[PDB]
Amino acid sequence: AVHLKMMPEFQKSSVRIKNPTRVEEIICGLIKGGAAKLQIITDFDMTLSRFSYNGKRCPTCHNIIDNCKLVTDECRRKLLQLKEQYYAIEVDPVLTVEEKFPYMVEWYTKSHGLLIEQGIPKAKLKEIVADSDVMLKEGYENFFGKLQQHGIPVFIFSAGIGDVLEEVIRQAGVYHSNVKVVSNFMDFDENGVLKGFKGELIHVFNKHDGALKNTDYFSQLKDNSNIILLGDSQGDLRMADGVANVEHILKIGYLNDRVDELLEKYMDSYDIVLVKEESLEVVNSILQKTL
Ligand SMILES: [Mg+2]
């Protein structure tokens, strides 16, 4: 039987749970099913990676390129302005999520388009990432290592840059076979320089779309009817729309920011909310009981 009261990881003051008995019931199903029934579906930026370090704000996969030596200060002025105009839209409380779709497409298309202009070679991404300020959450080695140990599917679903994401996890030693990455991947020309992005755009609000267009992946995993979902945005809640059959799903949300504005919405939509939390210990503690 599961008791969150007896799990020291859940006593941390960053842990917000609206419905503890409901959560206990889900973790209880997760445990019952064990390895055989489990898969992970996860956002990357600010979920697997840190939102902040030494009083310092950590980069997203996009920020890694924005900030690198291969991009002018003049490109960074444009990128900044874009963020100011379009982030105001993203967080606008009066607009419906649906009304924001076209704005998001515009933002990612404009900002990717400035990066394409800077001329990013594939061969250089290794060093760009090594020199970057990127940080994985405390407990990542344990997170990925228990998962690979038990062959648990991990579907990282990211509106970031997939090439950047992969380099981060590769340099961290956690890009194991069990880890599938769906993201905005770069498209390279003859010389291995960036010319555009592959496929259809994944942004913060349309993960339902990509989730359904990954049938390929989810139907092979019919038997994995227990899901752990991790996100930091409301849009990450749609990341499991493509799952065959769902028996138990636990939704864990990182609330990193805008805490007073978003806490109620987060507590109502995610099962567990992790306020200003830079580790993976609550999910690791659930993996430990389960695996
Ligand atoms: Mg994120």
Swiss-Prot record:
Tissue spec: Isoform 2 is highly expressed in the brain, heart, spleen, kidney and blood. Isoform 2 is expressed (at protein level) in the spleen, skeletal muscle and gastrointestinal epithelia.
Known role: Nucleotidase which shows specific activity towards cytidine monophosphate (CMP) and 7-methylguanosine monophosphate (m(7)GMP). CMP seems to be the preferred substrate.
Catalytic residue positions: D43, D45
GO cellular component terms listed in the entry, alphabetical order: cytoplasm; cytosol; endoplasmic reticulum; mitochondrion; nuclear body
Binding-site residues for Mg(2+), renumbered to this chain: D43, D45, D232
Reaction it catalyzes: N(7)-methyl-GMP + H2O = N(7)-methylguanosine + phosphate; a ribonucleoside 5'-phosphate + H2O = a ribonucleoside + phosphate
Molecular function per GO: 5'-nucleotidase activity; magnesium ion binding; nucleotide binding; transferase activity
Annotated compartments: Cytoplasm
EC number: 3.1.3.5, 3.1.3.91
Entry protein name: Cytosolic 5'-nucleotidase 3A
Main location: cytoplasm
Family affiliation: Belongs to the pyrimidine 5'-nucleotidase family.
Organism lineage: Eukaryota, Metazoa, Chordata, Craniata, Vertebrata
PANTHER family, A to Z: 5'-NUCLEOTIDASE, CYTOSOLIC 5'-NUCLEOTIDASE 3A
Positions of modified residues (Phosphoserine): S233
Gene3D superfamilies registered for this protein in UniProt: HAD superfamily/HAD-like, Pyrimidine 5'-nucleotidase (UMPH-1), N-terminal domain
UniProt source species: Mus musculus (Mouse)
Keywords: Cytoplasm, Hydrolase, Magnesium, Metal-binding, Nucleotide metabolism, Nucleotide-binding, Phosphoprotein, Transferase
Source species, domain of life: Eukaryota
GO biological process: adenosine metabolic process; CMP catabolic process; dCMP catabolic process; dTMP catabolic process; dUMP catabolic process; UMP catabolic process
InterPro entries: HAD-like_sf, HAD_sf, Pyrimidine_nucleotidase_eu
UniProt enzyme class: hydrolase
Cystine connections: none
Binding, substrate: S158, A159, G160, K207
Sequence positions that bind CMP: E90
Subunit structure: Monomer.
